[PDB]
């Protein structure tokens, strides 16, 4: 008797914060930010799902996601998210 | 409409009468709420800072208590496991024996 | 802030004693220790105080929460000093607990027999209601505690016991350990205390214990076999008794469930609807056979009463903060039934909220860590009564220092 | 040959891809805030010992005005307050911080005569106004709305019989409340809905 | 415990995107005019009758010295110590290693907005 | 037992790696999601919101507004060279265009 929905506002506000102290950001703007968010989660999971599957592979790994960064973003943007995401891999398994 | 309605609306006006014998008896709500307050408050006051310190050690002590009943939880839990495993390495042994008939 | 010191906690039926700033005290035992007049000899451990012994008086110092007997209550403090906590005195000052209610003459007493005696550094006299409050983490908030020999509730404003609003009802653990003895007279129940007993054999339900009797007890006296009775009696207050979650109704007690115990002789029965009529007599005391009168407030009354007594502006606080503590508050369904009659009674105009502790060292001994949380704060470390303050002020100083 | 060695999903992701010398110290520290010159005792590093007290900021008294007996005398007296009367009202205040919820229930009502919360507030004020009269002249702000006891004893009570309404008040009441309602709509879609209809007749 | 800061991640320089030229002029600016600032950390009603007081007669507009013979020296900003470096980004001056590495920390780029 | 430590905060992410691997867990994107996934991919997906979000706040700022619109979205997306290449075929509601005025199309 609820119907609660969920967004992701609550982490691009940690993020906004966090990036720009003083700025705020406005609910039809966080729709937009939150749209952003859905869509490249869709684009960079189904291209490595792609991935796994072109070399016959039933699992969908953080190997096949870095590829497929590689495949999304242009140049630059690749380059930072790659670096971004392989240094959040060797912080999580390093049991920090 | 119909001319019924005079029924219905004379229980309306027994509902006003009603009412106002209500409000002779002690009234609907609690009308003008604090219309006068001059007294100035403290600086902040020695006291307030007790009751804030001890609102923020009150917290601090519930989250040692039960940091610590889940501490010594997953001590109990890692050492289950741990004596687990030193159950499996008898199945170690006898597994690498099984592994010498094979070789 | 938190510096070497002893807090106290001397509740009617047990005292606990320990360090500024732990979870929880570092001993617990009978307040109603053993003695015999040998000056007289003492007993506080259980494992002294359970042996049957050649003369006992089983003397219980306090008198409804308030100390009577300042000799045995020397002794406790004493024993408490070197066998618990074995440290000087007049090293560590003293943070102690006394009823909402105590008078002025025997805080005076105290705080002249602590300095004198025990020729403590510091000292600190603090009502079980701010040290429950401190403890739950609120300034304000009624105290509704649940103790041994009475249940009270005491509202609490920003940080100060409200006298006018001090309820009290003698519906505590000592009148349940009454019903308790009346219900095992009513079966016919052969309640035997457990020093009684050499060995024993299994038998059936409801039929009589198979035991052997030791052969070396001396003649005992009448109190020390009271209490012991009385702790098996609210061991099986810990372990039968169930509070109805509504209004008792004999039909539906019936058709409640049973549960099964065990005296320590070996006698063993399943017990039913009496199970919950018992503590029925807490929340509405008009159907207690033998205890005709509307005199009495229950639980829930109790705390009604004690937040009408208060001004209307404090009440929606007091109901927003109801902090609920002591042992008799751990029987089954106590905070629910307590919860739901509160609910019916408290006006519509204001929010009604119980703080939600409900381990066994929460709801007892609020008071304890009461004053193990404010002894541990710089805000608090002024507000010490200092051994300077006994020497020039004399022994009043504790009606001018703290509340 | 795979050189490897290290966690093997970071491992993947990066090649496939190409003497504590300072003693604490049980230490004796007097409060600054205090004026008893208490010895506490603390558990301080080896590199401040010595230093004042850093909860002794935490000590805002909170302000009452200290009438002297002339004073009191001259133009604080009241035919209805006694000074033995009037000094425990400051006494307490002082004992707790200037608040009269805490204030009331220690109120000595063996030497003295039963007072409301009202009336003591009232009194207080009186006195702090009084007080600062004396001054008046350097600048002491003689615009004190001092605390109401008049309406507020009233603005007290008018809420304590809507406190305790059992049924009816507290739920009888919904009818009237719908009422404010059906008042305010059908009065004048009654007699205003009349005078329309009259005039839309009457061109018709 | 954790190193507790890749959870703000505030810099993340993958995309820096220097600032230059004309917001170097920008801050050059902005710093003269709060060193002209006031207590704050009427001036409009003295921009609007400065601004009536434009001619070219002698007055205060054309009572401007102007630019100096001896040329700008160079000082570090941090410690004030005369500075044998320029910052290569906002051109901000500074005489170590360890003024530079304050100046990226707290100065470069940071208030450029 | 131990106190619970999220995935967002091992890592050191604040988008939900819970939520993002919990959406590939049920979203048949694959057939057994492994232990690395979500957070690269989480992890890319708030390094894009960051990357934008610093440019539309900077052209909000030039807008002297402290809020960003939907035009402080159109304005950076399209400001950005790569941006703009990675959300060329997405229309950013309420953010208008950009003050492209075509050379030939002016006073002359
Ligand atoms: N586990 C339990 N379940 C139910 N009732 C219990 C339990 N433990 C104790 N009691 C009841 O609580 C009573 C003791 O309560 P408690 O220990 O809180 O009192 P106290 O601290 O001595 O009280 P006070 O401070 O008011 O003098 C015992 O007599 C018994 O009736």
Redesign the pocket.
Known sequence: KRSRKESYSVYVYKVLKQVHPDTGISSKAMGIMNSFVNDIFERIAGEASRLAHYNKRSTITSREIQTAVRLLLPGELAKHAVSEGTKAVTKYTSSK | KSHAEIAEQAKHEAEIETRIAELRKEGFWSLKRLPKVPEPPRPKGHWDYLCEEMQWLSADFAQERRWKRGVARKVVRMVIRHHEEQRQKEERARREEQAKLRR | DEVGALVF?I????VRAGYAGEDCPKVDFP?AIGMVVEGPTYYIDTNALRVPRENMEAISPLKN?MVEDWDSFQAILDHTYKMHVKSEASLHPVLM?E?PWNTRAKREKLTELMFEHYNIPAFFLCK?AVLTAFANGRSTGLIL??????T?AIPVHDGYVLQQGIVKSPL???F??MQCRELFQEMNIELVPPYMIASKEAVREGSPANWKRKEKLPQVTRSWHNYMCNCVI?DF??SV?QVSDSTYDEQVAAQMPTVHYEFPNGYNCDFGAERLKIPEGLFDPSNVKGLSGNTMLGVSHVVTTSVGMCDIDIRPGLYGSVIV????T??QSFTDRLNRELSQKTPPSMRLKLIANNT?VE???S?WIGGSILASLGTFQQMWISKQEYEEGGKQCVERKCP | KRPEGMHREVYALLYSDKKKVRPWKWMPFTNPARKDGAMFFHWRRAAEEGKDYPFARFNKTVQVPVYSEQEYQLYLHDDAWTKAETDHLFDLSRRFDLRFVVIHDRYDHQQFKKRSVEDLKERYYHICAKLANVRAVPGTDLKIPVFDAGHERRRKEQLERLYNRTPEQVAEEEYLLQELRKIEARKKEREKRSQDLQKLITAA | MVEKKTSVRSQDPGQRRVLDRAARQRRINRQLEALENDNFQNFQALLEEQNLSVAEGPNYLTACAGPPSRPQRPFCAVCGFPSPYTCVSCGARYCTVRCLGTHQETRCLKWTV | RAKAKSRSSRAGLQFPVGRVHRLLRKGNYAERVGAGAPVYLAAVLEYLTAEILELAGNAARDNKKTRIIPRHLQLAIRNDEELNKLLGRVTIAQGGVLPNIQAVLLPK
Not at chain 3, 11 to 14: A, D, F, N
């Open positions: 906690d509740g009617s039926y047990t307040t929460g607990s009823a079980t505690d649940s103790g041994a020999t009475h009270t505590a653990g000592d349940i350990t609210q207050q810990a008794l503590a002591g042992g008799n751990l029987i066994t709801r007892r001994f008071s």
